[PDB]
Structure formats: C-alpha cells, structure tokens
Amino acid sequence: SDGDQCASSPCQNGGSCKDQLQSYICFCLPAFEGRNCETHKDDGSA
Secondary structure: OOOOOOOOOOOOOOOEEEEOOOOEEEEOOOOEEOOOOOEEOOOOOO
C-alpha cells in the first residue's frame, strides 16, 4: 500500500501504466503527451 495511482489505469492511448513510488508513469506511444496520456502530439501544433 503506497498510493494506488496506476490501479485506476489512468494511462490512456492504450499506454502501459507503471507504479513509481506514490506517483506513476504511463508508457504511451512516442506521438502522445499529457500526464495521463490525454494529448495526441503527432506534429506539435503549439
């Protein structure tokens, strides 16, 4: 028990969710962005 942030599968874009001490880290595709992988960065836009 140490903060279940990945247990909720927040990593979107079908990325791999991994626990990293309390916080978490999503392993989405290299063309995606956002803390929970909620931004598709293919060109960059802004």
